[PDB]
């Protein structure tokens, strides 16, 4: 009966659809992400932290300090042998 008008009804359409929820998720997801590996805190020491940073990161990740811990029990219990028997 007249010139009907759905070319411009986008302004209040852009809430209900599914990429709108993904869009408002990931524009929030992107800003607080640190850019290029920044603030990783690669240097730390608390009298036991260099042990962790040298041994217990994902780079080395070897169980040989447990060996040393086992050696520590060889340092401990055998000396407890010297304290008991």
């Amino acid at each position: 009966v007249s010139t009907l008008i759905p070319p411009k009804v986008v302004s209040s359409k852009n809430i209900g659809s599914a990429p709108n929820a993904k869009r408002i998720a990931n524009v929030v997801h992107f800003y607080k992400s640190l850019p290029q590996g920044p603030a990783p805190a690669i240097k730390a020491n608390t009298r036991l932290a260099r042990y962790k940073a040298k041994y217990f990161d994902g780079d080395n990740a070897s169980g040989k300090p447990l060996w040393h811990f086992a050696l520590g029990i060889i340092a401990f219990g055998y000396s407890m042998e010297y304290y008991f028997h």
Binding site: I5, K8, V9, V10
Partner: protein, 58 residues
């Protein structure tokens, strides 16, 4: 007219047509509701245009 040699009505119907030679004026009546239609058009259009011009760069 001169084809009919027994004319008798051609002056009558000719002056009847020349009588109704001002037939009827046209209808340029819409200048108030049509501007409201294009007002809603420009409204929703500039809403859409500003929103997409923001969200493209966003």
């Amino acid at each position: 007219r001169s084809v009919l040699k027994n004319t008798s009505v051609i002056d009558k119907i000719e002056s009847y047509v020349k009588q109704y030679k001002p037939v009827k004026i046209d209808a340029s009546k819409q200048l108030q509701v049509i501007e409201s239609f294009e007002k809603h058009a420009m409204t929703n259009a500039k809403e859409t245009e500003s929103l997409v011009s923001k969200e493209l760069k966003d």
